[PDB]
Amino acid sequence: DAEFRHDSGYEVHHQK
Secondary structure, three states: OOOOOOHHHOOOOOOO
């Protein structure tokens, strides 16, 4: 997921 960072569009609604 590091090579595919997409947290820029991720809500804390779903557990990481």
